[PDB]
Amino acid sequence: SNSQTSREAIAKELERIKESIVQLANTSVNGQYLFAGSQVANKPFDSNGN
Amino acid sequence: RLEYEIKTLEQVKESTSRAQEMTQNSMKALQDMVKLLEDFKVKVTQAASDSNSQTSREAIAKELERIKESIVQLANTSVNGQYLFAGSQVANKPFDSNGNYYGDKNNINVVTGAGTESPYNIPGWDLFFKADGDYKKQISTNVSFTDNRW
Amino acid sequence: QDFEGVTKAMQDLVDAYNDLVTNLNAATDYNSETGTKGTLQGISEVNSIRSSILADLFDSQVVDGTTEDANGNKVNTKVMLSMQDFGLSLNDAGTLSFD
Amino acid sequence: APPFTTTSTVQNGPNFSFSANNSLTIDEPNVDIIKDLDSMIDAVLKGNMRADSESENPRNTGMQGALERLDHLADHVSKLNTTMGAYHNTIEGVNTRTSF
Amino acid sequence: TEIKTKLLSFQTAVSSLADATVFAKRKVVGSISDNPPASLTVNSGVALQ
Amino acid sequence: INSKGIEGLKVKVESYNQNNVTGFRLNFSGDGSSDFSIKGDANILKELGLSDVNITSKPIEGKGIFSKLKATLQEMTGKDGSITKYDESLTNDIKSLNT
């Protein structure tokens, strides 16, 4: 029933939810990237999943 | 180090707090404008009638005229001179009564993350002049035609 | 024919319209006493539906008319019009009143 | 130049144009809010649900096109609500994220 | 939920707005109260005679 | 044909003298409700100056906005409804907080 951008109206938050996952993975817990493997000093991702 | 973490975390919480309130008032204001749009077309809806006199056309249109300029008033609003729709450049009375713009096209932002930014602010130009992909451009003739067989 | 039975219901329905209008207003609107976005106020689910369905509600027709305004054919014409014009008066308060 | 048929012949046109006795469009993605309202009042005052080339305003079929134009523009407002509301949920989470 | 009930409440109201039931129907008129002449039975579509 | 009582239809016969040819030609009308569709021995139809032919049903709308509005509210109130979607989430949102 939505127009296409009307569907993208819902995309508004999905962008952030996607982005929210992105930032939550990158977290430098205590400045230490638990998610960067053994190298927790390295910021694990580009924020695009690489 | 752990205290600095909390010490810094507190700065974010207040920072997030002060923007969150502006959002609710910002969301509030936007729909308030929408209502005037809603009230605009309702009066237009009955205006479509045909038996009406010229002053009747005035009679409705005049209220709509004030809604026009009134919306221009509310569009130019600032909180403490922070004009709610001047893009990344909000210190400016953004609009005029002909719809021309007096802010910029970018978006103010404030940083919240392990090196992350958060942009929120509306550029009034794009608000007044951006385009949508759902839509297309309509086009028609102005000369009009008839059976002149008499 | 005896239209009237529903005719009364329609206006009673108009009343049952206004109550929902009030319910939207009472429920959906702000909470400024705490300068607060009311619980349901400002919700995307709320604002989208409220405006859209009301817009859905207003949809109109084309009709003929005796005329000194509008598109015109002569001092008679064809016109784009809807329910309120012949039927029922629409308030700045949103509600509907009967004529 | 002739000869033609009762079918098209083809020729090339100019490289550029800047103003012309062009055709009419009264709805297009790029918004022009106030001037749209300005043209609308023009049609409203006269009672123009239709314009003609010869009309004093040779082009402004304001009232009918306005309905289309307004709805198109109203949609632009709607999705902005979605972006704007999306802000608060996002930042609200950040404060929540920060708080815990 | 409570307001949705109001929506639900008026939805049935809208449901009637979609209908055209009574407006098909018919009724008769007469001029005797007792010791009766005759009775006619009518419903929708009968002539407005 | 007119004897069968084909509902809303009767048939008239009409002549032809054109292009120095003499002929007899046929016509009929209908209310457009359904397709008019035919079975006949094509061979006799040819001798009749005929062939099995059809023009389709073709209604016209009333634009039942109150029905369409009713449909709009059916989906929104039904399990399909987005407001119904978020109603479900509040349960989930409460569930997650409890968990």
Swiss-Prot record, chain C:
Origin superkingdom: Bacteria
Compartments where located: Secreted; Bacterial flagellum
TM stretches of this protein: none
Subunit-level organization: Homopentamer.
Function: Required for the morphogenesis and for the elongation of the flagellar filament by facilitating polymerization of the flagellin monomers at the tip of growing filament. Forms a capping structure, which prevents flagellin subunits (transported through the central channel of the flagellum) from leaking out without polymerization at the distal end.
Stated family: Belongs to the FliD family.
Annotated protein name in UniProt: Flagellar hook-associated protein 2
Gene: fliD
Parent-record interval covered: 298 to 396 of 642
